[PDB]
């Protein structure tokens, strides 16, 4: 509370992402004055056009206070969250957003799987799992919405985009990817659901899950999908 609100506000409004993040964390611990600065920043930046990590971090930091008035104000002003909930198939992404805004990552993971089957159409909806060719033909827009929500509500630590970047970093070697994202530990495949880490202590890329029971083809088709380069992920 001895921190300088004028200077922290300026740090948030400057263009350095790394300095924005430290300012946001400090401001959120500075009562009405700091929280008011954060609320004004949201008001000036929402709805997003492109995903902006700092804006997601402001929203989620404020939600995570779990204080009545701020929660009420965020829900009234941003009833669908901070990012347009767009779909090439008219799908409803609000339940996914709500789970993510509550930091209920396990529910969000379950919803994401249901939505991908819905997106793939009647065959996938009935069998409740995907073929790699269905993934290849997903519309980019829906994948962008889904990924943006995961990324914005996890400080950039979750999302298929995050997994893709780690997969590229590993030379596209899936056997190196699994330990990096916590899906295998040496010889031990992480058991679903109890072995997974349903919070932000999880490794980067841990969520959303892609079951490996039917092999890696779905994951590879997802990571190679044109959406990522199209939207700058
Ligand atoms: C490679 C070993 C591996 C095994 C033995 C495995 C088994 C497995 N995973 C399941 C579900 C599931 N398993 C996962 C995810 C995982 N589960 C894991 O063991 C791992 C490593 C992940 C990776 C994220 C998910 C999300 C489900 C529920 C969705 C689905 O049934 O596809 C089921 C239940 C299928 C059913 O009831 O119809 C089995 C038998 N999955 C695997 O990937």
UniProtKB/Swiss-Prot annotation:
Domain of life of the source: Bacteria
Cross-referenced Pfam families: GUN4 (PF05419), GUN4_N (PF16416)
GO molecular function: tetrapyrrole binding
Family membership: Belongs to the ycf53 family.
Protein name (database record): Ycf53-like protein
Native source species: Synechocystis sp. (strain ATCC 27184 / PCC 6803 / Kazusa)
